[PDB]
Amino acid sequence: MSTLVYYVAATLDGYIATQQHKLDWLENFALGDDATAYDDFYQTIGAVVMGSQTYEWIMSNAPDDWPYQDVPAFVMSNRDLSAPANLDITFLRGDASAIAVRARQAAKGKNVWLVGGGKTAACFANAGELQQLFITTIPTFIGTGVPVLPVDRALEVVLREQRTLQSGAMECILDVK
Numbered sequence: 366m367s368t369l370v371y372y373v374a375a376t377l378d379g380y381i382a383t384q385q386h387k388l389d390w391l392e393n394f395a396l397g398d399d400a401t402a403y404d405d406f407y408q409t410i411g412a413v414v415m416g417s418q419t420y421e422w423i424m425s426n427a428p429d430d431w432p433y434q435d436v437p438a439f440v441m442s443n444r445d446l447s448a449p450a451n452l453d454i455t456f457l458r459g460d461a462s463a464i465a466v467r468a469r470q471a472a473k474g475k476n477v478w479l480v481g482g483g484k485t486a487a488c489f490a491n492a493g494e495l496q497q498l499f500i501t502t503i504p505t506f507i508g509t510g511v512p513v514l515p516v517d518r519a520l521e522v523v524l525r526e527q528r529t530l531q532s533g534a535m536e537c538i539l540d541v542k
């Protein structure tokens with residue numbers, strides 16, 4: 366069917382942000398020309414899913430430039446949060462299965478991009494709803510920070526592809542189960 370994919374950038378110790386929710390280690394790093402183009406991945410996406418912390422990061426850091434206007438967007442939270450009334454943004458909560466079929470439908474046969482973050486990704490994985498991961502790994506350790514996938518127990522994956530870029534960053538596709 367349609368794939369729920371976790372496409373994310375992470376440190377070598379498996380963190381997707383500093384403990385203060387900063388991405389200096391990420392944004393200050395030049396992936397290089399030989400990286401897989403962002404567009405080529407985003408072309409395969411028909412919906413995005415997010416937790417509320419990642420939503421608030423994007424709105425505080427790019428308030429006038431929502432990046433996913435091209436697709437519907439589902440933000441999970443237990444608040445009655447509000448989006449600018451002009452943006453394709455829905456707020457859902459609870460069981461991760463219902464959210465996935467809602468998002469897979471809206472994706473129209475394209476994939477659902479689980480942008481994150483960790484807590485949200487783990488909710489889906491614990492529910493057996495996460496099917497693939499695409500990780501860009503930055504050659505750095507930050508010691509502590511936001512965990513990429515805080516699952517409750519060991520989630521094993523099959524390595525389906527891996528590239529090492531000229532800059533030291535790496536890319537891999539992981540299939541769940």
Ligand SMILES: NC(=O)C1=CN([C@@H]2O[C@H](COP(=O)(O)OP(=O)(O)OC[C@H]3O[C@@H](n4cnc5c(N)ncnc54)[C@H](OP(=O)(O)O)[C@@H]3O)[C@@H](O)[C@H]2O)C=CC1
Pocket residue numbers: 372373374375380381382386387388391415416417418419420422441442443444457458459460461480481482483484485486488511
């Ligand atoms: N480096 C990268 O490539 C990426 C980095 N990031 C970073 O990750 C950080 C945040 O990741 P994280 O800290 O894991 O927080 P999340 O982004 O996972 O948001 C977590 C929140 O989502 C809500 N939520 C999750 N599951 C459910 C559910 N089943 N039902 C209802 N609400 C739910 C809750 O919000 P509430 O409290 O509202 O209930 C929870 O606190 C941010 O700093 C972001 O910038 C994000 C994506 C990729």
Ligand SMILES: COC1=C(C)C(=O)C2=C(C1=O)[C@H](CNC(=O)[C@H](C)N)N1C[C@@H]3Cc4cc(C)c(OC)c(O)c4[C@H]([C@@H]1C2)N3C
Pocket residue numbers: 372373374388391392396403419422423426427432480501
């Ligand atoms: C592949 O390597 C990745 C690198 C090198 C990255 O910089 C980033 C990622 C990578 O995967 C991925 C997604 N890739 C993306 O290209 C877009 C930004 N979504 N990201 C997910 C998001 C959403 C977002 C949004 C905005 C507006 C950001 O402002 C720039 C931003 O930094 C971020 C980021 C981060 C950026 N978090 C919060």
